[PDB]
Symmetry: D2
């Protein structure tokens, strides 16, 4: 219950990122709702956070852009006084068979999903190291652990994030900062995209829970890691996937 | 907030097991405090649980003994009406280098730490499958993941528990029962034998957190798994170890 | 190339164990073909090894029995002068859903598959430690990594073996003994068990190679670990499974 | 035993890459020795390969450069008729603490180590899928599995490679192409610039083998994966590290 904490959530305007922002606010956090493109959705998330008694601002930044990231973190600290929690949820997919995959499809996914984590982690570190506390939680993917045929770029990025999480955990331990990852499986708000009722039905056979997850399942896990009580957990990846990857 | 839940915690009379029993009770559960030996410590845990507004009973059973286990689960259901949560924390250590390790040292550790999980999981399954809900959380050890020179028996047992957790998760998922494991690192309560300060200091070097954990760290993780909100997490092992094993 | 080496292979009378025995002999090893009750078949394996220019003997031992194991190792050293390689392949399955699994089904699988590895590793260590070289390779199963619904006992046993492998690797490393595990997937001779095409075809979809393995696939990997050239590999588990577990 | 095979080895002019090139040639492969910088060392490797009876050419390509890669693969097929084996060994390190690490230090390491694997895999797949056979082996690092304080960029890259390996294994299986990774530990030719006795001694304590590896240890493993006999192994990572990461 995050009272007096401030959280910066990247890619917070919908789905998982939105559910995370809202849940953090519910536990008492002030929230920076980052978005890349659509201001309108981000503003809705801000409105909802204010409704439930917390404070929030919407900030536009490309997490693959060093200057954007620097200004975003700076705004957070300017408006809310500090940064206590970073959740790295920004990321795109550009699926294709390896043989079909364009160099720019590769670059855009790696830069957004992996380099964003690097850039954001780097930018918040100085503030967290100085204050001698912090939480970083990186949203990876179970596909980063097992691989996945359509997604060489995305798998590489998310596997990279899981590794980056461990280096960060190790480097920041001395200043009471924990760094952990959540690896979602197949969550409903990620699959507004995939509507073929056969590709869907097969995916579902892979899950012992026999159902797709919900955005709140990921928020539940993030909030647990963001909390003071989980202080002795660092460098870990928790799969939230209905048993798909064990 | 486990309201109306009933939990059976094996090896609950002290240290980690005790902290688990108390935290579950704190969240509203009625608790069965299992013990093997002297009943005084178990009775203290029961007294504490009643103090904080919940209900509890102390039940003696060797978890390696089929009839003891059967009777224990039966008592739980008889007294409290049902069983909602099982945490398998019973276990002994009998350390020795492999080539000196006695066969009985091996057997006792395997039977207590591994067979106990089997037996207790089997015993509660009927009840949980019928009611169509449940939580099982197994206390393993980070040493099960990495290996450890003094502890062939213990490492084998705990690695086995981690695998058993996955089979259970898979078998029980269709009935809304989740099964997960917590792998503790070096926790202060479980380090009473270790007063050799050169073993301690070199152990401590292995932990990025640069400190030993506390029993409550394990309780917080168990409670998270035992809760309704973690419903989409199954077959997973969470290391609570200050970053020791990543 | 295994010239002048002597190998003890437990459960060597057929399938994977047989293929291992034969391949080791092919590379120049003298082989002890261990069996539990199938002497007919152990003698055939012995005959085949002698045909290809090597030497072998068949030795009955229950690997769960300390007296048998000690007898067996001693016979190896008595007949062939030394023991250079141990492959632990003995093991039974007794499948059942957790809720139905008998205590004796549990015990027999744990004792054969897990305690056998302990007992045999213990028995050979002193010889290997004294001569300051050795290879131990443990045959586990990919099911020990992922879990598997029908097989709580088998999964627990094989997960345990993978952990035991690491402790052994660590304890024996400075006497230039390496200890590694092979985790087979679905191998054809290993599924004389299954003839039912319902479960059989469901298994095949899980394998990217889109076909079951052969006993020789496991032998090829064992022989690689058994060789002098793999000296810098220890405590590892290699999945031989057509890509089923990545 | 690689008779009639042709191998393309990236970063093959020295150390691990060179040992790999030479060992493949030893087993009968014709080899393309790729280099980035000055062509001299690459020419020496080529000379050595010819001495031992095989054929080779040295080819300049930035593995992060799409056109370079495309031309390199095309030259391979033009000169040697086909490509049967790809080993991705190209890669740089640019170490720094996260909060000191430059954006270009990040980029250069990610592009060379991770994007190079993508680009080369893509380029050869074309030819391997058609002929319906191939071997890709990616050289990762054990640091990609555990994390490592000085090396956020390198860890992210190598963790990414391990994931990319799995996607590739899965996509290429239907055309009888296997894709695996070797994760080296601390190998003597990788450590020239670790001059400090203090930093060396501590690294060594982490290795149960109590010694650094040699380039040939990696070549041993690569050759095993490149061979026909390892056909049922795909999507796997093998640590060659003296027991450092179990």
């Amino acid at each position: 219950m995050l009272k007096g904490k401030v959280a910066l959530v990247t890619g917070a305007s919908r789905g998982i990122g939105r559910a995370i922002a809202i849940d953090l606010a519910k536990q008492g956090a002030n929230v920076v709702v980052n978005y890349a493109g659509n201001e309108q959705k981000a503003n809705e998330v801000v409105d909802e956070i204010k409704k439930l008694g917390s404070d929030a601002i919407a900030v536009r930044a490309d997490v693959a852009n060093a200057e954007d990231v620097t200004n975003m973190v700076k705004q957070t600290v300017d408006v809310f006084g500090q940064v206590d929690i970073l959740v790295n949820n920004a990321g795109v997919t550009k699926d294709n068979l390896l043989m079909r995959m364009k160099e720019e499809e590769w670059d855009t996914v790696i830069n957004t999903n992996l380099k964003g984590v690097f850039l954001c982690t780097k930018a918040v570190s100085r503030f967290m190291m100085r204050q001698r506390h912090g939480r970083i939680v990186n949203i990876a993917s179970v596909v980063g652990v097992t691989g996945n045929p359509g997604q060489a770029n995305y798998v590489a990025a998310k596997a990279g994030v899981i590794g980056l999480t461990k280096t960060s955990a190790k480097e920041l331990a001395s200043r009471n900062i924990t760094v952990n990852a959540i690896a979602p499986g197949f969550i409903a708000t990620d699959m507004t995209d995939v509507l073929d009722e056969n590709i869907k039905a097969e995916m579902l056979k892979l899950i012992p829970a026999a159902q797709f997850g919900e955005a709140q399942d990921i928020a539940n896990a993030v909030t647990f890691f963001a909390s003071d009580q989980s202080k002795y957990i660092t460098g870990q990846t928790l799969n939230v996937d209905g048993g798909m990857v064990m």
